Nucleic acid binder design. Structure first.
Ligand code: MG
Ligand code: MG
Ligand code: MG
Ligand code: MG
Ligand code: MG
Ligand code: MG
Ligand code: MG
Ligand code: MG
Ligand code: MG
Ligand code: MG
Ligand code: MG
Ligand code: MG
Ligand code: MG
Ligand code: MG
Ligand code: MG
Ligand code: MG
Ligand code: MG
Ligand code: MG
Ligand code: MG
Ligand code: MG
Ligand code: MG
Ligand code: MG
Ligand code: MG
Ligand code: MG
Ligand code: MG
Ligand code: MG
Ligand code: MG
Ligand code: MG
Ligand code: MG
Ligand code: MG
Ligand code: MG
Ligand code: MG
Ligand code: MG
Ligand code: MG
Ligand code: MG
Ligand code: MG
Ligand code: MG
Ligand code: MG
Ligand code: MG
Ligand code: MG
Ligand code: MG
Ligand code: MG
Ligand code: MG
Ligand code: MG
Ligand code: MG
Ligand code: MG
Ligand code: MG
Ligand code: MG
Ligand code: MG
Ligand code: MG
Ligand code: MG
Ligand code: MG
Ligand code: MG
Ligand code: MG
Ligand code: MG
Ligand code: MG
Ligand code: MG
Ligand code: MG
Ligand code: MG
Ligand code: MG
Ligand code: MG
Ligand code: MG
Ligand code: MG
Ligand code: MG
Ligand code: MG
Ligand code: MG
Ligand code: MG
Ligand code: MG
Ligand code: MG
Ligand code: MG
Ligand code: MG
Ligand code: MG
Ligand code: MG
Ligand code: MG
Ligand code: MG
Ligand code: MG
Ligand code: MG
Ligand code: MG
Ligand code: MG
Ligand code: MG
Ligand code: MG
Ligand code: MG
Ligand code: MG
Ligand code: MG
Ligand code: MG
Ligand code: MG
Ligand code: MG
Ligand code: MG
Ligand code: MG
Ligand code: MG
Ligand code: MG
Ligand code: MG
Ligand code: MG
Ligand code: MG
Ligand code: MG
Ligand code: MG
Ligand code: MG
Ligand code: MG
Ligand code: MG
Ligand code: MG
Ligand code: MG
Ligand code: MG
Ligand code: MG
Ligand code: MG
Ligand code: MG
Ligand code: MG
Ligand code: MG
Ligand code: MG
Ligand code: MG
Ligand code: MG
Ligand code: MG
Ligand code: MG
Ligand code: MG
Ligand code: MG
Ligand code: MG
Ligand code: MG
Ligand code: MG
Ligand code: MG
Ligand code: MG
Ligand code: MG
Ligand code: MG
Ligand code: MG
Ligand code: MG
Ligand code: MG
Ligand code: MG
Ligand code: MG
Ligand code: MG
Ligand code: MG
Ligand code: MG
Ligand code: MG
Ligand code: MG
Ligand code: MG
Ligand code: MG
Ligand code: MG
Ligand code: MG
Ligand code: MG
Ligand code: MG
Ligand code: MG
Ligand code: MG
Ligand code: MG
Ligand code: MG
Ligand code: MG
Ligand code: MG
Ligand code: MG
Ligand code: MG
Ligand code: MG
Ligand code: MG
Ligand code: MG
Ligand code: MG
Ligand code: MG
Ligand code: MG
Ligand code: MG
Ligand code: MG
Ligand code: MG
Ligand code: MG
Ligand code: MG
Ligand code: MG
Ligand code: MG
Ligand code: MG
Ligand code: MG
Ligand code: MG
Ligand code: MG
Ligand code: MG
Ligand code: MG
Ligand code: MG
Ligand code: MG
Ligand code: MG
Ligand code: MG
Ligand code: MG
Ligand code: MG
Ligand code: MG
Ligand code: MG
Ligand code: MG
Ligand code: MG
Ligand code: MG
Ligand code: MG
Ligand code: MG
Ligand code: MG
Ligand code: MG
Ligand code: MG
Ligand code: MG
Ligand code: MG
Ligand code: MG
Ligand code: MG
Ligand code: MG
Ligand code: MG
Ligand code: MG
Ligand code: MG
Ligand code: MG
Ligand code: MG
Ligand code: MG
Ligand code: MG
Ligand code: MG
Ligand code: MG
Ligand code: MG
Ligand code: MG
Ligand code: MG
Ligand code: MG
Ligand code: MG
Ligand code: MG
Ligand code: MG
Ligand code: MG
Ligand code: MG
Ligand code: MG
Ligand code: MG
Ligand code: MG
Ligand code: MG
Ligand code: MG
Ligand code: MG
Ligand code: MG
Ligand code: MG
Ligand code: MG
Ligand code: MG
Ligand code: MG
Ligand code: MG
Ligand code: MG
Ligand code: MG
Ligand code: MG
Ligand code: MG
Ligand code: MG
Ligand code: MG
Ligand code: MG
Ligand code: MG
Ligand code: MG
Ligand code: MG
Ligand code: MG
Ligand code: MG
Ligand code: MG
Ligand code: MG
Ligand code: MG
Ligand code: MG
Ligand code: MG
Ligand code: MG
Ligand code: MG
Ligand code: MG
Ligand code: MG
Ligand code: MG
Ligand code: MG
Ligand code: MG
Ligand code: MG
Ligand code: MG
Ligand code: MG
Ligand code: MG
Ligand code: MG
Ligand code: MG
Ligand code: MG
Ligand code: MG
Ligand code: MG
Ligand code: MG
Ligand code: MG
Ligand code: MG
Ligand code: MG
Ligand code: MG
Ligand code: MG
Ligand code: MG
Ligand code: ZN
Lengths: 64, 107, 149, 100
RNA sequence: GGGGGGAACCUGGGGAACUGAAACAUCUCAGUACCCAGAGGAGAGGAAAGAGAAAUCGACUCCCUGAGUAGCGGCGAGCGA
RNA sequence: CUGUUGGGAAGCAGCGCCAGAGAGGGUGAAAGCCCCGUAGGCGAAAGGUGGGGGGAUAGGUGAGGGUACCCGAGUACCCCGUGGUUCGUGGAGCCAUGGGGGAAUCUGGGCGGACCACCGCCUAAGGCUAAGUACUCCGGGUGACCGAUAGCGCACCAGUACCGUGAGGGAAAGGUGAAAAGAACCCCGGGAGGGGAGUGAAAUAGAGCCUGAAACCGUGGGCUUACAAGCAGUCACGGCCCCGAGGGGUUGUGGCGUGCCUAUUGAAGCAUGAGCCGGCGACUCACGGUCGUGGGCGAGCUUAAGCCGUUGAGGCGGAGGCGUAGGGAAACCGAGUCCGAACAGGGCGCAGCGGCCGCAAAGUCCGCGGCCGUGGACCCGAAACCGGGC
RNA sequence: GCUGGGGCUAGGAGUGAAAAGCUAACCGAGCCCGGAGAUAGCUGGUUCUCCCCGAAAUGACUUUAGGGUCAGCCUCAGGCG
RNA sequence: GGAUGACCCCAGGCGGUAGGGGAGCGUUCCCGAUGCCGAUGAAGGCCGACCCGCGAGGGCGGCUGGAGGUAAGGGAAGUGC
RNA sequence: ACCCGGUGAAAUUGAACUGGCCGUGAAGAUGCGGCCUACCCGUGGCAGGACGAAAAGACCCCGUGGAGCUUUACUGCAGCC
């Protein structure tokens, strides 16, 4: 049978134009009152995954 | 349905193969089951017999061996040559075996 | 040339790797699997693309993002595929979505929107949308933009 | 391409021959054998005969050294198998259509 | 007229567990295995109180594609038009 | 058809012949022409079938105006509890319905994902309906399917023998020879068995029968061994025996020397497995994916089901899939986009080789290979769990 | 009290002057066939030849500790020099 | 050096478990094959102190055996205990 | 039980050309070292060794293995209100 897309990956992550893997930064889902504005602001950006853990995730999205 | 026999008791046949190749003889018996014939004076074997009321003193008797039917060919009672057999429909309209060299009946 | 002269090129048909076939093969006994452990077993390990030995996975510690949508699912709206001016240089006269369907430039059931990479060529091109730069370039180059809905 | 090259190979070899018609061959094998001789086919070389004329195919078919084809049946394994290619003009036309 | 039989195939009435979730309970296996009732050379379905956006199509069945898409999901494992 | 070899011609030789037939099986060996067949044709009084061809029959058929009679009831509908759908209570519609309440007949009623309005679609609560689809007890055809431990559990008198109270379990076992010509008869023996004779091309083809490997047991022959300390060998030398400046066999003495496998930090190990021999026995296949590779085409590449043709002949089929553009949760914009008040700053994106030709290449298609995913997924092994029966 | 014949009660069920005793020579849950090739991070086994290279037994995290993910160390192909 | 596996000369490397890579041997089957080897003896079996190959093996010869076997080059696996 | 005639098993078994001591060795050696002792082969006997045989330790730990039992463990169900 043809493979199935891992949906929890599809909902968290994106394969960029060159095949990098990008995600929202972790750590401001909550507990934010005592964090700086610098913490919050930076954590609002996307980041790029380390080569190994990124290569694993692309395999779970084989029809993107 | 039934075994095909191009030869029957007792038309005359040439043995065209084996140790008796070229001999001519009458078809003594046809054994469709084994697909073999018995040709008079051909394929003689020596069989031993026990001393009995049939054969007291005993010793041996001579017997004709069965020959594979393919090894035998009917001779045309018209032209006198060994031939393959054809069939022909008459007016009856029964069918008969006929010589392929000339149109002879083979019965 | 005859049948016995038919050959694959060198490299075209390669032999398979056969394990578990004697000492001298270099693949004997354990069949390149090492000693013991889950991996050596028939059935092997859990999907290494995801599983990490029981700790929360890399993937599952990242936050989800954006609209995923609800039943009854996708909302049917008109879709736009862009095609560049440079892609249009091959044609003469008039170009319309169906033409660029045939030439295998635009995918079916998609609305044409002309974009600006390349040059403009004095064509009468008919689309559902143009980019600002494609509009200028094409008007400037003696072409004739034609708008559909 | 395979179909083109297969024929092209036999041409470069001087082994390709196109024929206009098949004389008096009207279904009897001995007729083909006659015609064969007139065209250089003794049967020291195996031939792939390609024609749409059934009666020619039926004549030539039982031969050990002849393989027979209708032109839509032209295929490269059959081309390579045989030492000589023999095609009706009618056939050569349809072979032309399939390669262009 | 009925009864009973028939290798699989079919419909309907009932309907598990191991297992998977590297524990487990929702979930999975799966409406599967199996039990029962009925059909028949097939069975089911079938001439719109339909589709769902085409200002459109036009009974049903079956294959390909749509598509592992849309979605569903301790949004886990997975399930999946 | 003749010759020749041979037990046997179909082998070899010589001279022919058929072919819409040179598929294949047989015949004493290897046969187009000996046999059975094959190509191409022919055939049913009777029974079955008959979707095709013909014919009958049932059944089918107008337009305005008026009337407001009828248009499927414990039904629609609403609420409670559930099931079905991709939908697990979710904004939860739809279809179905166990309980409760309970209509209307076209100015009627259901649906278009809560609901409302607007705009459309459709006609619930009666029934039937070929074909296209599924299966293989049965018959036939064909195999880069097995060949007696294989192939069905069964090639053989097998669901048997045998095991079990029963449900149920469930084997082993094929081959003389071309032809029985299956060995008259005599001899030893109670018989079995054998020795002669005989048959046969062959009898270590004799029925306890093709081939007849190995473990294993025996007879005969060479070499060798009863003061010798051994993972059994090896290296050296010498003696004896065989074959004919060399080899082979044997081994007296001397030197050296801790089985194999598995598992382990480490085994000769007093750690595992193995009596020995023979045969069976473990990394595969399908579909996806990812790298590499051999080729076809290249801003393009490619078809799936199907249809036509073949009967080991290929073609058609462009639906669809991948690629050609990205950024953004999205609206949206687009070689840019997102964040932002920003023309700031950032994230993620954007740009061949030679003389128009060649050459290469994005990409894509197919073959091959490594590895991954889903399947039992390298083979064997649980204790258990569940269903129906006994 | 013992005993013949004829009967009834059985699998989470019977029966038990109670021993988890007995339910067809192994009962803390019978036997048979099926789901089934259950699952086994465990043990055993894994079959021809030659040539080149050639480890690890660490760190992080882990209901993890004799199993894994990534890193470390090995190997092949392409590129750099 | 010759010019690209033609061979020659010179120099260096070549212990090895897990494991990576490379090159080969053989078994069954298909194309080659309406061919070719085969009763003046197929396969298989028993020998050999002979030949070729590093090796897996491949030849050759004698005996057994009595009807099959299958090349160069390629294809495919129920392929080596 | 022994001897003679008759019939004739078994578990086990890597192969065996299977001595003592002091040592050594994965820590208790017929098999390694040094020494000592020892002609070849049986029969009836005895049980100290071959970590003798038999039973993939029944104790212990380990496995995110199972099963029976408990309860103010969790979550359900029958039953009852
Ligand atoms: Mg966050
Ligand atoms: Mg949180
Ligand atoms: Mg937030
Ligand atoms: Mg929030
Ligand atoms: Mg602070
Ligand atoms: Mg601050
Ligand atoms: Mg703050
Ligand atoms: Mg902010
Ligand atoms: Mg896609
Ligand atoms: Mg894409
Ligand atoms: Mg007849
Ligand atoms: Mg003859
Ligand atoms: Mg004669
Ligand atoms: Mg009659
Ligand atoms: Mg291959
Ligand atoms: Mg290799
Ligand atoms: Mg193996
Ligand atoms: Mg090997
Ligand atoms: Mg290797
Ligand atoms: Mg190795
Ligand atoms: Mg292993
Ligand atoms: Mg490996
Ligand atoms: Mg591996
Ligand atoms: Mg292992
Ligand atoms: Mg290890
Ligand atoms: Mg192992
Ligand atoms: Mg280990
Ligand atoms: Mg491992
Ligand atoms: Mg282990
Ligand atoms: Mg295992
Ligand atoms: Mg398994
Ligand atoms: Mg496993
Ligand atoms: Mg944890
Ligand atoms: Mg989406
Ligand atoms: Mg819907
Ligand atoms: Mg103009
Ligand atoms: Mg030929
Ligand atoms: Mg031919
Ligand atoms: Mg009934
Ligand atoms: Mg019935
Ligand atoms: Mg049902
Ligand atoms: Mg019912
Ligand atoms: Mg049900
Ligand atoms: Mg139940
Ligand atoms: Mg469960
Ligand atoms: Mg399972
Ligand atoms: Mg799983
Ligand atoms: Mg589990
Ligand atoms: Mg688990
Ligand atoms: Mg548990
Ligand atoms: Mg469970
Ligand atoms: Mg499962
Ligand atoms: Mg279900
Ligand atoms: Mg059912
Ligand atoms: Mg079933
Ligand atoms: Mg019935
Ligand atoms: Mg049908
Ligand atoms: Mg019906
Ligand atoms: Mg109707
Ligand atoms: Mg699509
Ligand atoms: Mg999720
Ligand atoms: Mg389901
Ligand atoms: Mg003679
Ligand atoms: Mg002759
Ligand atoms: Mg001749
Ligand atoms: Mg033919
Ligand atoms: Mg033939
Ligand atoms: Mg034949
Ligand atoms: Mg014979
Ligand atoms: Mg011949
Ligand atoms: Mg032959
Ligand atoms: Mg023949
Ligand atoms: Mg016919
Ligand atoms: Mg016929
Ligand atoms: Mg009217
Ligand atoms: Mg009314
Ligand atoms: Mg109605
Ligand atoms: Mg009613
Ligand atoms: Mg409603
Ligand atoms: Mg409801
Ligand atoms: Mg539900
Ligand atoms: Mg929800
Ligand atoms: Mg719903
Ligand atoms: Mg509504
Ligand atoms: Mg309702
Ligand atoms: Mg109701
Ligand atoms: Mg109303
Ligand atoms: Mg209305
Ligand atoms: Mg309704
Ligand atoms: Mg609707
Ligand atoms: Mg709506
Ligand atoms: Mg509607
Ligand atoms: Mg019906
Ligand atoms: Mg019809
Ligand atoms: Mg029907
Ligand atoms: Mg039908
Ligand atoms: Mg059949
Ligand atoms: Mg065979
Ligand atoms: Mg057998
Ligand atoms: Mg058998
Ligand atoms: Mg045999
Ligand atoms: Mg049978
Ligand atoms: Mg029997
Ligand atoms: Mg019993
Ligand atoms: Mg019995
Ligand atoms: Mg049983
Ligand atoms: Mg048997
Ligand atoms: Mg025989
Ligand atoms: Mg016989
Ligand atoms: Mg006598
Ligand atoms: Mg006597
Ligand atoms: Mg006797
Ligand atoms: Mg005697
Ligand atoms: Mg005798
Ligand atoms: Mg004689
Ligand atoms: Mg002879
Ligand atoms: Mg012999
Ligand atoms: Mg013999
Ligand atoms: Mg015997
Ligand atoms: Mg024989
Ligand atoms: Mg014998
Ligand atoms: Mg014997
Ligand atoms: Mg022997
Ligand atoms: Mg002796
Ligand atoms: Mg002394
Ligand atoms: Mg001495
Ligand atoms: Mg010593
Ligand atoms: Mg010396
Ligand atoms: Mg010597
Ligand atoms: Mg010597
Ligand atoms: Mg020595
Ligand atoms: Mg040493
Ligand atoms: Mg030793
Ligand atoms: Mg040592
Ligand atoms: Mg060994
Ligand atoms: Mg081993
Ligand atoms: Mg072992
Ligand atoms: Mg161990
Ligand atoms: Mg140990
Ligand atoms: Mg240890
Ligand atoms: Mg030892
Ligand atoms: Mg020992
Ligand atoms: Mg032990
Ligand atoms: Mg041991
Ligand atoms: Mg152990
Ligand atoms: Mg044993
Ligand atoms: Mg032995
Ligand atoms: Mg063995
Ligand atoms: Mg593999
Ligand atoms: Mg590829
Ligand atoms: Mg191409
Ligand atoms: Mg796709
Ligand atoms: Mg920017
Ligand atoms: Mg940039
Ligand atoms: Mg190219
Ligand atoms: Mg390419
Ligand atoms: Mg691949
Ligand atoms: Mg590998
Ligand atoms: Mg991989
Ligand atoms: Mg499976
Ligand atoms: Mg498997
Ligand atoms: Mg696998
Ligand atoms: Mg098992
Ligand atoms: Mg049990
Ligand atoms: Mg339980
Ligand atoms: Mg239970
Ligand atoms: Mg049960
Ligand atoms: Mg039961
Ligand atoms: Mg009484
Ligand atoms: Mg009584
Ligand atoms: Mg009684
Ligand atoms: Mg009683
Ligand atoms: Mg009772
Ligand atoms: Mg009872
Ligand atoms: Mg009862
Ligand atoms: Mg019962
Ligand atoms: Mg029970
Ligand atoms: Mg209980
Ligand atoms: Mg239970
Ligand atoms: Mg109870
Ligand atoms: Mg009592
Ligand atoms: Mg019992
Ligand atoms: Mg008992
Ligand atoms: Mg239990
Ligand atoms: Mg019992
Ligand atoms: Mg059953
Ligand atoms: Mg299952
Ligand atoms: Mg399994
Ligand atoms: Mg388990
Ligand atoms: Mg376990
Ligand atoms: Mg090295
Ligand atoms: Mg460590
Ligand atoms: Mg960590
Ligand atoms: Mg922790
Ligand atoms: Mg560890
Ligand atoms: Mg473990
Ligand atoms: Mg790693
Ligand atoms: Mg390094
Ligand atoms: Mg690497
Ligand atoms: Mg390199
Ligand atoms: Mg050197
Ligand atoms: Mg080197
Ligand atoms: Mg080495
Ligand atoms: Mg290499
Ligand atoms: Mg082999
Ligand atoms: Mg090979
Ligand atoms: Mg075959
Ligand atoms: Mg052939
Ligand atoms: Mg042949
Ligand atoms: Mg010859
Ligand atoms: Mg002979
Ligand atoms: Mg001979
Ligand atoms: Mg052979
Ligand atoms: Mg063979
Ligand atoms: Mg040899
Ligand atoms: Mg031989
Ligand atoms: Mg033959
Ligand atoms: Mg071959
Ligand atoms: Mg070959
Ligand atoms: Mg080929
Ligand atoms: Mg195998
Ligand atoms: Mg005495
Ligand atoms: Mg005695
Ligand atoms: Mg020894
Ligand atoms: Mg001794
Ligand atoms: Mg010590
Ligand atoms: Mg001690
Ligand atoms: Mg020891
Ligand atoms: Mg000691
Ligand atoms: Mg000693
Ligand atoms: Mg020693
Ligand atoms: Mg030493
Ligand atoms: Mg000693
Ligand atoms: Mg001493
Ligand atoms: Mg004694
Ligand atoms: Mg003792
Ligand atoms: Mg004792
Ligand atoms: Mg004693
Ligand atoms: Mg002792
Ligand atoms: Mg000892
Ligand atoms: Mg002891
Ligand atoms: Mg022991
Ligand atoms: Mg005992
Ligand atoms: Mg015991
Ligand atoms: Mg065990
Ligand atoms: Mg144990
Ligand atoms: Mg035990
Ligand atoms: Mg234990
Ligand atoms: Mg312990
Ligand atoms: Mg425990
Ligand atoms: Mg736990
Ligand atoms: Mg654990
Ligand atoms: Mg447990
Ligand atoms: Mg339990
Ligand atoms: Mg009560
Ligand atoms: Zn005549």
């Amino acid at each position: 049978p043809k493979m199935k897309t891992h949906k929890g990956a599809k909902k968290r992550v994106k394969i960029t134009a060159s095949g990098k893997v990008v995600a929202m930064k972790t750590g401001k889902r909550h507990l934010n009152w005592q964090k700086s504005g610098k913490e919050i602001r930076q954590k609002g950006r996307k980041f790029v995954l380390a080569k190994p853990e990124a290569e694993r995730i692309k395999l779970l999205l084989p029809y993107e | 349905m039934r075994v095909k026999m191009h030869v029957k008791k007792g038309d005359t046949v040439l043995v065209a193969s084996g140790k008796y190749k070229g001999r001519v003889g009458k078809v003594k018996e046809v054994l469709p089951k084994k697909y073999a014939v018995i040709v008079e004076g051909v394929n003689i074997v020596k069989k031993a017999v026990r001393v009995s009321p049939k054969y007291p003193q005993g010793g041996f008797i001579e017997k004709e061996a069965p020959l594979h039917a393919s090894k035998v060919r009917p001779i045309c009672p018209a032209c006198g040559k060994p031939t393959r057999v054809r069939k022909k429909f008459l007016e009856n309209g029964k069918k008969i075996r006929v010589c392929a060299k000339c149109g002879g009946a083979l019965d | 040339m005859k049948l016995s002269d038919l050959r694959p090129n060198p490299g075209a048909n390669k032999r398979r790797k056969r394990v578990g076939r004697g000492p001298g093969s270099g693949h004997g006994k354990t069949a390149t699997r090492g000693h013991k452990g889950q991996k050596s077993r028939s059935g092997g390990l859990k999907d290494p693309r995801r599983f990490e030995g029981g700790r929360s996975t890399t993937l599952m510690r990242l936050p989800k993002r954006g609209m995923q949508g609800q039943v009854p699912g996708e909302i049917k709206r008109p879709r736009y595929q862009g095609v560049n001016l440079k892609d249009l240089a091959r044609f003469e006269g008039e170009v319309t979505p169906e033409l660029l369907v045939r030439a295998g430039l635009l995918k079916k059931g998609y609305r044409l929107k002309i974009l600006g990479e390349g040059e403009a060529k004095p064509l009468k091109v008919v689309a559902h949308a143009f980019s600002k730069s494609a509009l200028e370039k094409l008007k400037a180059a003696g072409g004739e933009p034609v708008l559909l809905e | 391409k395979g179909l083109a090259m297969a024929v092209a190979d036999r041409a470069r070899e001087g082994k390709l021959l196109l024929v206009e018609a098949f004389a008096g061959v009207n279904g009897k094998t001995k007729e083909f054998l006659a015609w064969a001789k007139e065209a250089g086919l003794d049967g020291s070389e195996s031939v792939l005969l390609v024609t749409g004329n059934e009666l020619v195919r039926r004549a030539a078919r039982n031969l050990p050294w002849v393989v027979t084809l209708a032109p839509e049946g032209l295929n490269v394994y059959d081309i390579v198998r045989t030492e000589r290619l023999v095609m009706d003009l009618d056939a050569w036309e349809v072979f032309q259509n399939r390669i262009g």
